[PDB]
């Protein structure tokens, strides 16, 4: 199975704003880099408590909750990405993406 997944065409959704950037999943966690501002966010695998897959304004999106109460939303996936994302979360993050 894949040890990394990369999405170069998704967006972080913050209060209705859509910030383009690059999302990279590895066995250790998730990194998002905002293309405009260069701002990098990191989520460690062990910090994830919940992952949700749902329809959003552009395609589908992930909504991720961490143990410290932070919420991260990444939007603009094709629906066909669900299987690889679901498998990655289950295998490496030991979490089952909830479909809502």
């Amino acid at each position: 199975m894949a040890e990394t997944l990369e999405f170069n065409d998704v967006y972080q959704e913050v209060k209705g704003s859509m910030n383009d950037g690059r999302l990279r999943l590895s066995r250790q966690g998730i990194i998002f880099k905002n293309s405009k501002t260069g701002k990098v966010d990191n989520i460690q695998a062990g910090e994830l408590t919940e992952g949700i897959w749902r329809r959003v304004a552009l395609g589908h999106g992930l909504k991720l909750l961490t143990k410290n109460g932070h919420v991260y939303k990444y939007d603009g996936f094709r629906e066909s990405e669900f299987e690889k994302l679901s498998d990655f979360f289950k295998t490496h993050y030991r979490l089952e993406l909830m479909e809502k």
Side-chain angles (χ1 to χ4, degrees):
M1 251 202 59
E3 309 170 14
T4 63
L5 298 174
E6 175 185 11
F7 303 89
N8 296 296
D9 68 332
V10 296
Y11 302 84
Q12 184 173 9
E13 188 265 308
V14 180
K15 304 190 154 191
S17 281
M18 293 280 280
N19 300 327
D20 53 288
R22 185 172 176 216
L23 186 69
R24 286 174 286 177
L25 287 70
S26 68
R27 293 175 294 175
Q28 171 59 25
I30 307 178
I31 301 174
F32 182 79
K33 184 183 177 184
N34 183 308
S35 294
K36 189 165 115 71
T37 67
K39 182 64 179 154
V40 176
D41 297 310
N42 302 277
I43 301 164
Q44 319 301 316
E47 294 175 327
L48 283 168
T49 60
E50 200 168 312
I52 294 167
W53 173 254
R54 73 268 181 83
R55 193 179 303 278
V56 294
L58 187 70
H60 278 69
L62 289 170
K63 179 164 88 101
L64 306 181
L65 177 66
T66 65
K67 286 180 176 172
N68 64 8
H70 286 185
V71 182
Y72 296 89
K73 294 174 291 172
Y74 301 109
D75 287 3
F77 294 95
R78 292 169 302 164
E79 189 166 14
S80 60
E81 305 283 17
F82 175 75
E83 172 174 357
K84 59 194 262 220
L85 285 163
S86 176
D87 285 348
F88 201 98
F89 270 70
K90 194 167 327 189
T91 299
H92 301 303
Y93 306 154
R94 312 205 315 285
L95 256 185
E96 286 170 8
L97 282 187
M98 296 178 272
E99 301 178 67
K100 299 183 70 193

